[PDB]
Amino acid sequence: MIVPVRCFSCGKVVGDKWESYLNLLQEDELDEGTALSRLGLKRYCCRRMILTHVDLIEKFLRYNPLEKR
Amino acid sequence: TXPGVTXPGV
Amino acid sequence: FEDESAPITAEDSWAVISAFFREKGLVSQQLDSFNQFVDYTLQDIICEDSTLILEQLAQHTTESDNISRKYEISFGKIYVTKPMVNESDGVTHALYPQEARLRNLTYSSGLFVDVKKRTYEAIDVPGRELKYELIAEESEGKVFIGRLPIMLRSKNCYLSEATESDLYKLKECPFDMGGYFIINGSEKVLIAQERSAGNIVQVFKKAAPSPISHVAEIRSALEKGSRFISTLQVKLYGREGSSARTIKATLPYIKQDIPIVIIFRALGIIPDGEILEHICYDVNDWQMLEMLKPCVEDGFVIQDRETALDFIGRRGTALGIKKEKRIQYAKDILQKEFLPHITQLEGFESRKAFFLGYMINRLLLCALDRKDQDDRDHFGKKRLDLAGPLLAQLFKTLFKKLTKDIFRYMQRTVEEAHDFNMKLAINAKTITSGLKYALATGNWGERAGVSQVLNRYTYSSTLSHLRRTNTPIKPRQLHNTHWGLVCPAETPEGQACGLVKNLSLMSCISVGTDPMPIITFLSEWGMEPLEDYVPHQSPDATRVFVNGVWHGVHRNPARLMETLRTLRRKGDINPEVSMIRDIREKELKIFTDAGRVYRPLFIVEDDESLGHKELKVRKGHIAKLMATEYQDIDVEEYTWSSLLNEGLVEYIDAEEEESILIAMQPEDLEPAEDVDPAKRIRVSHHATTFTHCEIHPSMILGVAASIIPFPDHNQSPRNTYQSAMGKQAMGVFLTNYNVRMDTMANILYYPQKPLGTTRAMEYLKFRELPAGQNAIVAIACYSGYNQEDSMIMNQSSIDRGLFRSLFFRSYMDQEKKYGMSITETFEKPQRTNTLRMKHGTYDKLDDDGLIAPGVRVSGEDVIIGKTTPISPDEEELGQRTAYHSKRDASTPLRSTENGIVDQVLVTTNQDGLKFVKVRVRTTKIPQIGDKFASRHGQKGTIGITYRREDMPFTAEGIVPDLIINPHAIPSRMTVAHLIECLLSKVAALSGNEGDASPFTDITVEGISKLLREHGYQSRGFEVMYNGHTGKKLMAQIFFGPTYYQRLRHMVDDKIHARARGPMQVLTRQPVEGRSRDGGLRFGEMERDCMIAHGAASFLKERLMEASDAFRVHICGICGLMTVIAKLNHNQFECKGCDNKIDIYQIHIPYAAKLLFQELMAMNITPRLYTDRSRDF
Amino acid sequence: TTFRFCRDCNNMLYPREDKENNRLLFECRTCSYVEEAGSPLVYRHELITNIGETAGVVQDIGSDPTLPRSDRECPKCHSRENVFFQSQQRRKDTSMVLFFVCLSCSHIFTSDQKNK
DNA sequence: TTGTCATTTTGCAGGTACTCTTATTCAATATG
RNA sequence: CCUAAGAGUAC
DNA sequence: CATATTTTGCAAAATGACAA
Ligand SMILES: [Zn+2]
Ligand SMILES: [Zn+2]
Ligand SMILES: [Zn+2]
Ligand SMILES: [Zn+2]
């Protein structure tokens, strides 16, 4: 849905490394492994936390708000 | 037969 | 690449598959069949018959009015509109699916037909033939005859041309595929119904006890007529050792089995030689002649066509025809009832005689042990009725009912001489109600389970449901012909194992086309007409069949097949048409009917440039397809239809698949002939005569089985278990779940795309809508709390969001007009003037009787407040006065459920009465008893949860999210589980995605080499330390990420206990079900176990005190319970026996009392006596 | 058996005893067409049928792609390439002997050894 | 004063528990 | 509330 | 305008003669 705050197994905070990860993937044309290593995710628990996330919230944001102010 | 698979017979 | 004509590789085929799914989609068969039904079948149903003529004779007592009239009504073109809804105020406006779903409407579109009324008049002159003429009163004027439900995304739906942005605007998920109806706000899907194909001759052996040894039958049926099933059977009487081997045919509406030669003579073939020529096509085949001589010996008694017709009429079951008209009756039987699929007109006796000879030929070939009896399970002999044909036959019946009603109304209004009106004639309620009833309920009439509620638990579950086929009822076995058409391992484990099937990824169903162009092509290219066919002059002639109708013979079948293939490969013939050439049997069969299941295949040609067989597709076509796909994500478009129209790929069904040779992969099987020991063993087949090539073997799997990583490394029952169990996986079923009021919805907090992924799962959108999470799994006998399929889940991981879920439940409530002014009202009931108010608190309800969103609700609390008017001025119950004019009809929350009210929706129903829906949201957090499973059938419940400090840890501080027992591995042989764990570890470390496609060249050795290059033990073992003491574990632990699904079976929805509760009104026993606070069944064999234990008093206590104990009085004279017992006055009296001092009381189950009273009501006296009259 | 038909009305001919010459005489049952008998055989019953195993062979049997190919010696052309298939008699007790058709001469030769 | 042998009709029921959802209750012509 | 139907869990 | 009625597994039991 949206990026998890912490890695499930060890508890490292990874919720602030999603936009940086996307910027590294897009702007710098880095592959996923090097981008993960750059952000400091060395254990594969954190690496699978960030690598396999699906950002479904964008889809949810496409629909018009039900209660619009 | 049986039933199923009366009897036979009856 | 650089070379345009270079051969393709195994990787290039995925581009072809991508193009296929860019054009077809996943539910293409549903939409195609419905579009065929709407575009063409409705018009055919309307035009065929539906010309009501009523001839009102003159009935002239005087010659002044000797005029006979004739009123005729005809139906012209049919117009089907866009879906629209009526309203209580009469305003009609466009209806969209995400309004019908919310308002419980039906997504249907009105049907109109141009009705033309004509009247003819004639002078009723006796003797002179009547001549009818127009009176120039030609009135025509469309009329509304009903509403057809429209499936979503069909050509007549609002979403067919919608873009992604428009779909977002209309509150429709772009991932939603359509192919389902909305009946009363419920999504209904039509399961593809399997049946045996029609107009095919099948010969079956018979058992020893039966007198008939072999039976040849055809299920004759005509598509463009009455659509009635008439079964012709040709039976060979006598066993192998019998001498009187006579062949007899079972004609319809005939009480006896007529001998075949009688039928030949009736059709118009008198001489025996001509009959045998029509039956046996070989003069030298003296065995068939010897076997067939008893038939001519039997029929020697009849030597004339009129005699045979009289014989058939005499055997006719009507028995209401005079002797000279029996001939006509037999003629009618042989014209409109014998082999209808050939023709219904007259003058085609020779064709039917030839077909009968062909049937007898097949029967004799099977009896002579020259061919095996036909396999009933051959999938090429089966047809799948999709939404099109099902709706077509239902609408045919329903419109026949409507037109009969129209004729009856016309007759009634002309006999009563009243005025005629079109609006009073048509009753659109007939069609509308019939279609809505057939789609709303499972039953298909006026079969069961044809239409089912669409499964919306998970995206893959919805996809599998939309591609499901059911076989009405070894048929359960996986047949050889099922290859590439249905999923080899996707079927329920229960009674429906094998009967319920799922389509393969690339399998399609033909929609049926008109065979007239093909017949014209055959006649042009040199097909001999069957009327002037003499078998003797053309012995080696190939019989040409079109849709099971023998149309003639061809003398050069090779050239004919070559030109037919060329025409179909350039699109002149519809590619769905299947053409089969059986060289050994010298037959040519062409099938164009609907329901045939086919799949695409690459085409292999000679390719003289390379001197060896090669695929027609080269690198240039792959490059063009890639360019088109990249442009979609300015050059000429190159789609799947472009490959189809240039003879690159072909559609092959099972019948045509019988006569082809297929190469499994191009790179290994096309070119002519130090190997890796880790790779699996493959063979080259040592043969180069291929006609087609598989696009990819992994396409034999279905939607559910395409999620399995490395399915070829698993035992097949494990794949079946995962196929059945991934439909129960929890994830995101649709992106617009926030605007849908579904009855139940389950959503993961953090769905994750698998680390080990297949190439076929990016066409199923599994990476966009995942239904699981990557958990760090350790396979270890850690604490003994994961034995017998239990699991140990990390409590700290749960605290951080692992497998957490949202659960939505919706309650719907309407107000209904009990009368003219007896309308219900949504309100907050007041204890002062309301009856039957529930014990739940009504406080949370505000003025309108609906809890505002955000308010926490617990079990039994009232969430919808509704009251209904009743008759006032009644006093009873102790606290009932005239003020209690309202009866409470409120809806409380589920007793076992609680949560936050999420949303409430108020609107008007079809009738215009206000109704509401209340969606309540709660959060499910994994706990002891919840069911989780990998993608390899490794189900299990959570045994215990440990915190992070107690779990075993590696030298890097990584602790597992899950611990599973080693003992689950060896017996189940789920090697794919271990391979996928290793691959996921490598993928997580390296940042790539693990390619876990089934039939790739990815070995354990290579994955281990990559893992070792990452600095870990190559086989995935890790040195782990005990959590409690920190000491090293003597055994190293298999450790790594693995994809797990959270299944729908949570313990909190299953726990149930009952001390005492509501009792059944009839038997005074506890009610059934945990939703009703019911009781558990103490069945027969539990009683047997307790008897074996010898505990009699416990059994008595279970059957009497625990369930139902009833004290009843009897008398010693008659054992009946007819004792009037006034307990308060202490007076016992059995009328009839006239005793008052000879009464006993007994304790028996109330069910026993009810049984005795029912026996008494059935004239049986179960007299119960309290003393022995006989010694033991 | 080689059944034959009357040439007057196209009907069956049945065997008939003769007295003047004591010979088999074929007679018609509806037009009294009478003629001699080619052979004394009037009924053959094959308890074990040897024919029908090579049935289905056609002048273009090589066009079938499903039929397996072989390089076995053709004892009329000495050609390698040919098609082969097992016995077409679908009785459960038939042998697994193979038959070969040369695609250049259409001569059927078996792989049997007792016959050879 | 007793065997004979050879076609035509004779009845049916399918494991144990358990969970959930959906639809539907005769339509319509006819008389009070 | 009854009835019917469908889907499913453990054997 | 509203309620009332129009797939599966056989051995026998029974039947029609019958023959002097
Ligand atoms: Zn981590
Ligand atoms: Zn009594
Ligand atoms: Zn003759
Ligand atoms: Zn040869």
Residue C813 annotated as part of some ligand binding site: no
Residue-range domain boundaries for chain C: 3-25+594-702, 26-178+387-444, 179-198+376-386+445-511, 199-375, 512-593, 703-734+751-804+926-1062, 735-750+805-925, 1063-1164
Q: How remote is the CA of residue C1163 from the centroid of ligand 2, in Å? A: 16
Between strands C542-546 and C500-502, the pairing is: unpaired
* DSSP three-state, residue C1104: helix
Q: Containing H/E element for C72?
A: strand C67-80
- Give me ligand 2 centre to Cα C1120, in Å: 6
How many Å apart are CA C468 and CA C451, to the nearest integer? 11
The span from the CA of C155 to the CA of C173, in Å, is 18
Residue of chain C minimizing CA distance to A12: C800
Please provide the DSSP assignment of C129-154 as one string: PP--EE-S--B--EEEEEEEE--TTS
Method: cryo-EM
Cα–Cα distance measured from residue A8 to residue C722, given in angstroms and rounded to the nearest whole number? 25
Inter-helix orientation angle C619-632/C13-23, to 10°: 50
Check if the beta carbon of residue C628 is closer than 8 Å to that of residue C637.
yes
DSSP-derived secondary structure letter, C259: E
Architecture, CATH, for domain C735-750+805-925: Beta Barrel (2.40)
Minimum CA–CA partner of A9 in chain C? C797
Q: Residue C923: exposed, middle, or buried by beta-carbon count in 10 A (0-12, 13-18, 19+)?
A: exposed
Report how far apart, in Å, the C-alpha atoms of C697 and of each of C145, C663, C997, C1094 are: 49, 10, 10, 60
DSSP secondary structure code for residue A13 in this structure? B
Judgement on whether residues D55 and D110 belong to the same structural domain of the protein: yes
Residues 6+ apart with CB under 8 A from C1128: none
Separation CA C57–CA C74 (nearest Å): 20
Question: How many CA atoms does the CB half-sphere of C1125 hold within 13 Å?
Answer: 13
Domains identified in chain D, total number = 2
Other CB atoms within 10 Å distance of the CB of residue C514: 12
- Across the interface, whether the CB atoms of D10 and C691 are under 8 A apart is answered no
Residue C265 tokens, joined: 């003579």
Ligand closest to Cα of D109 equals 4
CA distance C1059 to C157: 54
Q: Which amino acid is at C259?
A: P
Distance (Å) of CA D107 to CA D59, D102, D110: 10, 6, 10
Listed in order, strand segments (DSSP E) in C199-334 are 201-205, 212-220, 230-237, 247-250, 258-259
- Kind plus residue range of the DSSP H or E element containing C617: none
Element (H, E) at C32: helix C28-36
Which pair of structure tokens corresponds to residue C1137?
A: 């026996």
Owning domain of residue D4 = 1-45
The answer to whether some atom of strand E lies closer than 7 Å to the beta carbon of C1161 is no
Its sign, for the CA torsion C524, C530, C535, C536, is: negative
Token pair in block for residue C109 = 């579109």
Q: How far: C245 CA to F8 C1' (Å)? A: 53
Residue with tokens 């006579």: C246
Q: Are residues D60 and D6 in the same domain?
A: no
| Domain C199-375 sits in CATH 3.30.420.40 | no
Sheet holding C805-814, edge to edge: C744-748, C805-814, C914-924, C899-908, C856-857
Written out in words, the top-level CATH class of the domain with range C1063-1164 is alpha beta
Nucleotide nearest C728, from its CA to each C1': F8
Name the 3-class secondary structure at C212: strand
A62/C168 Cα distance (integer angstroms): 6
Domain boundaries defined on chain A: 1-66
CA–CA min distance A10, chain C (Å): 6
Rounded Cα gap, residues C185 and C299, in angstroms: 65
Q: In what order do the strands lie in the sheet with C578-582?
A: C528-529, C549-554, C542-546, C587-591, C578-582
What backbone torsions phi and psi does residue C84 show, to the nearest 5 degrees?
-145, 160
Task: Tell me, yes or no, whether chains C and B touch by having 3 or more C-beta pairs under 8 A.
Answer: no
Maximum pairwise Cα distance, chain D: 62
Half-sphere exposure of C774 (CA within 13 A, CB side): 32
Among all chains, which residue has been given the structure tokens 């030769």? Answer: D109
In this structure, what CATH number is given to the domain that contains residue D109? 2.20.25.10
How many other CB atoms are found less than 10 A from the CB of residue C524? 8
Annotate C419-441 with b (16+ C-beta within 10 A) or e (fewer): eeeeeebbbbebbbbbbbbbbbe
Subunits adjacent to chain C (3 or more Cβ pairs under 8 Å): A, D
Beta-carbon neighbour count of residue C476 at 10 Å? 13
Alpha helices (runs of H) in chain D, residue ranges in sequence order: none
Residue C789: active-site member: yes
Residue type, position C1059, single letter = A
- Partners of C734 on chain A (C-beta within 8 Å) are none
By C1' distance from the Cα of C933, the closest nucleotide is F9
Distance C1086 CA to E16 C1' (A): 10
What ligand has the least distance to the C-alpha of D5? 3
For residues D53 and D40, membership in a common domain is answered with no
Cα–Cα distance for residue pair C112/C109, rounded to 1 Å:
10
Alpha-carbon gap: A1 to the closest alpha carbon of chain C (Å): 5
Distance in Å, CA C1117 to ligand 2 centroid: 5
* Six token digits for residue C504: 């393969």
Scan for tokens 């081997």, then name that residue. Answer: C245
Return the SS3 of C1097. Answer: helix
Q: Are residues D20 and D60 in the same domain?
A: no
Residue C1118 is classified by DSSP as S
Interface residue ranges in chain C relative to chain D, Cβ cutoff 8 Å: 271-274, 286-287, 289-290, 293, 296, 300, 303, 368-372, 540, 558, 583-586, 659-661, 687, 689-691
Distance of alpha carbon C403 from alpha carbon C407, whole angstroms: 6
Six token digits for residue C949: 């400090």
CATH of A1-66, one of 1.20.120.10, 1.10.10.60, 1.20.120.1200, 3.40.630.40: 1.10.10.60
Q: Which residues touch strand G (CB under 7 A)?
A: B 1-5, 7-10; C 209, 820
- Which residues 845-864 of C have a C-beta within 8 angstroms of A? none
Top residue of C214, C290, C555 to mutate, by most chain D CBs within 10 Å, is C290
Q: Among all chains, which residue has been given the structure tokens 């209580």?
A: C88
CB contacts < 8 Å between C and D, how many? 74
Distances (CA, A) of C31 to C36, C96, C738, C1008: 8, 18, 26, 46
Q: D36 and D77: one domain?
A: no
Chain A residues with CB under 8 Å of C755 CB are: 48, 51-52
Distance C981 CA to ligand 1 centre (A): 17
Orientation of helix C272-279 relative to helix C349-367, angle to 10°: 60
Q: To 5 degrees, how large is the angle CA C19–CA C20–CA C26?
A: 125
For residues C1073 and C1058, is the Cβ–Cβ distance under 8 A? no
Q: How many angstroms separate the CA atoms of C1119 and C1166, rounded?
A: 7
Could you tell me if C1007 and C982 are in contact, meaning their C-beta atoms sit under 8 angstroms apart? yes
Cα dihedral across residues C816, C821, C826, C831: positive or negative: negative
Assess if CATH 3.90.580.10 describes domain C512-593.
no
Taking the CA of residue C711 and the C1' sugar atom of nucleotide G20, their distance in angstroms comes to 82
CA separation for the pair C758, C315 (Å, rounded): 66
Question: Whole-number Å distance, CA C622 to C1' E12?
Answer: 62
DSSP state of C1075: G
D93 reaches C (C-beta below 8 A): no
Is residue D6 located within the same domain as residue D28?
A: yes
Interatomic CA distance for residues C506 and C764, integer angstroms: 12
CB atoms within 10 A of CB C572: 12
- The rounded Cα C1164 to chain-centroid distance in angstroms is 48
Q: CA C940, CA C740: separation in Å to the nearest integer?
A: 32
Q: Cβ contacts of residue C814 below 8 Å, gap of 6+? A: C824, C909, C913, C915
Is the same domain home to D106 and D78? yes
Which listed CATH number (3.20.20.30, 3.90.190.20, 2.40.270.10, 1.10.150.120) goes with C703-734+751-804+926-1062?
Answer: 2.40.270.10
Query: In Å, what is the CA distance from C275 to each residue of A60, C534, C759?
Result: 75, 12, 60
Please give the protein residue whose CA is closest to the C1' of the nucleotide F1: C1065
Angstroms from D89 CA to nearest CA on chain C: 5
Give the contacts of A65 (CB within 8 A, at least 6 positions apart).
Answer: none
Q: What angle do CA C15, C699, C159 make, to 5 degrees?
A: 70
Name the nearest CA neighbour of C56 among C72, C42, C68. C68
Residues D59 and D115 in one domain: yes
Element (H, E) at C942: strand C939-946
Torsion over CA of C1021, C1022, C1023 and C1029, rounded to 10 degrees?
-110
Q: Are C779 and C762 in contact (CB under 8 A)?
A: no
Residue C513 backbone phi and psi in degrees, to 5? -135, 170
Q: How many CA atoms lie within 13 A of C577 on its CB side?
A: 26
C44, C285, C375, C789: which one is catalytic? C789
Question: For residue A62, which phi and psi values (nearest 5 degrees)?
Answer: -65, -40
**Helix (H, G, I), strand (E, B), or coil: what is residue C62?**
coil
State both tokens at C909.
């129903």
Phi and psi for D59 in degrees, rounded to 5? -60, -20
DSSP C399-443: HHHHHHHHHHHHHHHHHTT----HHHH--HHHHHHHHHHHHHSS-
Q: For chain B, give me the number of helices (H) and strands (E)? A: 0, 0
Q: What is the per-residue DSSP string for C497-557? A: BTTEEEB-TT-EE-----SHHHHHHHHHHTPEESTT--TTT-TT-EEEEETTEEEEEES-H
The token pair at C589 is 């069969």
The phi, psi pair for C504, rounded to 5°, reads: -70, 170
Q: How far is CA C1122 from CA C693, C1029, C1108, C1134, in A?
A: 83, 77, 21, 6
C-alpha closest to that of C932 among C896, C964, C976, C970: C964
Q: Is the CB of C744 under 7 A from strand E?
A: yes
Q: Are C119 and C69 in contact (CB under 8 A)?
A: yes
SS (H, E, C) C709-765: CCHHHECHHHHHHHHHHHHHECCCCCCCHHHCCCCEEEEECCCECCCEECHHHHCCC
Contact C642, C571 (CB under 8 A): no
D39 interface with C at CB cutoff 8 Å: no
Q: Rounded to whole angstroms, how far apart are CA atoms C118 and C139?
A: 7
Taking the CA atoms of chain B, what radius of gyration do you get in angstroms?
5
Radius of gyration for chain C, computed over Cα atoms and rounded to the nearest angstrom? 37
Residue C879 CA neighbour count, 13 Å, CB half: 7
